[PDB]
Write a protein that binds this ligand. Sequence first.
Ligand SMILES: CC(=O)NCCc1c[nH]c2ccc(F)cc12
Length: 162
Amino acid sequence: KEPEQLRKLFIGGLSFETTDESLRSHFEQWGTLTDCVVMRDPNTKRSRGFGFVTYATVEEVDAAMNARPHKVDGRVVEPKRALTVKKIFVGGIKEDTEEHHLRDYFEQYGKIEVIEIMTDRGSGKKRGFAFVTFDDHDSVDKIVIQKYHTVNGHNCEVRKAL
Ligand SMILES: CC(=O)NCCc1c[nH]c2ccc(F)cc12
């Protein structure tokens, strides 16, 4: 079983009338839920407007994220995997890595809007790193939890870029 942390979706922006049961019935459309909680005040029991769900598998998390936007009990909510940005730094690509290497690999994580292969300001030579900007943060979130990224035969360092 994948680590539980990687099977969780944290759901912001809930309707205050959403319950454990209604949040569960909604997100069970995209997989088996082993846990589903609406956060509430300990004294008033009034919703805090957010919660989380835990799927049985990471593929189920993916399915839920691919089904965004989610309207739950009449309100569009904001699910996120376990710093919300749309851009990554990709290091270690050396001088022989081109746009199409980066595109063919990273397009399978999300929709790419910008690829920027970095060159030396003085010489024009490639510096061996790049930035990739996507249309949505979940691509980056999937990317940076991987232990490894292999592109053009290179083991790359990938992190969020601000
Ligand atoms: C952004 C924020 O502060 N809350 C959402 C993320 C989060 C952190 N710890 C939790 C515990 C329970 C839960 F339902 C959600 C969370």
